[PDB]
Design a protein around this ligand. Structure first.
Ligand code: OGA
Ligand code: MG
Ligand code: NI
Ligand code: ZN
Length: 331
């Protein structure tokens, strides 16, 4: 078995190997990349996502989210307080202000230490989940606005045509903005490109060990666990690397820099934080190997997780027994 320790793998495709997206994902899996839950892909030196980022300031962040923490430094939840709309140029100025800017630091490890020590004492503002794309239409390779859709993959594998569309989302971050422990909707893959700015640090649990993370989470967030049998779908819980190590949970970490892609694999729990002002683009995708994960994905039916239009067909076709209860939670 390839990659039996479930290490995060880093790939350097040539421009020739960068032509066929599906083929390269399948290659990475042939080398065991999925066992980690996360891989990094450094694009060939000839590739670019677009010519410049000089003209993005007028994008609107209609609902910036202030991420308010509760708990202890290594075990906390966050809630999202909606703020008034602002442009990307306004948000960048705010990220660089004395109140919100990255502190002085020696290196990524020192900054990681400072994040886990001090995150809970601040409430950074995240421009998350904005429908749109920064890939130039003329970028032919790994253009996250031109990937094959999940509905087309399901139809190709299973023969059933379904409603729904599959589009990318932009994330404008600042120091200490945080993504909570989660897997993707329906345990899909995700791909994330860091277009510009400061880094993003990721933590990930191998898919074969995801249930160990879930059992710890139920212990650490006992009221939330009684409320819902899949409360990690709410995307609000944080657990530090130190707490994971104390509880013997297998995980890995890596820092993504501007110009690099990350892929998360089905049922790969992940969490992380931004180092300073940045912009990422991400989308979900599927492969033939996903179908079995989609059929077994947990679901929130308490009402909290509330998701997209396109998830309805996935539940309805892959999980018909769960459909009625899940839909009640959606409505
Ligand atoms: O970048 C973020 O805030 C969160 N991204 C992801 O969870 C992802 O790309 O799957
Ligand atoms: Mg603009
Ligand atoms: Ni994700
Ligand atoms: Zn729930």
């Amino acid at each position: 078995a390839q990659n039996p320790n479930c290490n995060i793998m880093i790939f350097h495709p040539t421009k020739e190997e960068f032509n066929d997206f599906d083929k390269y994902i399948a290659y990475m899996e042939s080398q065991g990349a999925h066992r980690a839950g996360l891989a990094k892909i450094i694009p060939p030196k000839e590739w670019k996502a677009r010519e410049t980022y000089d003209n993005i300031s007028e994008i609107l962040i209609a609902t910036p989210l202030q991420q308010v923490a509760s708990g202890r430094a290594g075990v906390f939840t966050q809630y999202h307080k909606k703020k008034k709309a602002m442009t990307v140029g306004e948000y960048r100025h705010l990220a660089n202000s004395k109140k919100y800017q990255t502190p002085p630091h020696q290196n990524f490890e020192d900054l990681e230490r400072k994040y886990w020590k001090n995150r809970i004492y601040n409430s950074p503002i995240y421009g998350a989940d904005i429908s749109g794309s920064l890939f130039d239409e003329n970028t032919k390779q790994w253009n996250l606005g031109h990937l094959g859709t999940i509905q087309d993959l399901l139809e190709k594998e299973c023969g059933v045509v379904i409603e729904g569309v599959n589009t990318p989302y932009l994330y404008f971050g600042m120091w200490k903005t945080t993504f909570a422990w989660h897997t993707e909707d329906m345990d899909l893959y995700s791909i994330n490109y860091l277009h510009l700015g400061e880094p993003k640090t990721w933590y990930v649990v191998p898919p074969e060990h995801g249930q160990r993370l879930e059992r710890l989470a139920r212990e650490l967030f006992p009221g939330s666990s009684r409320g819902c049998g899949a409360f990690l779908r709410h995307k609000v819980a944080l657990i530090s690397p130190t707490v994971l190590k104390e509880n013997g949970i297998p995980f890995n970490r890596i820092t993504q820099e501007a110009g690099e892609f990350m892929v998360t694999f089905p049922y790969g729990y992940h969490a992380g934080f931004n180092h300073g002002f940045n912009c990422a683009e991400a989308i979900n995708f599927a492969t033939p190997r996903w179908i079995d994960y989609g059929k077994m994905a947990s679901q929130c039916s308490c009402g909290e997780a509330r998701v997209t239009f396109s998830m309805d067909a996935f539940v309805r076709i892959l999980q018909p027994e769960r459909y009625d209860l899940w839909k009640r939670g959606q409505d």
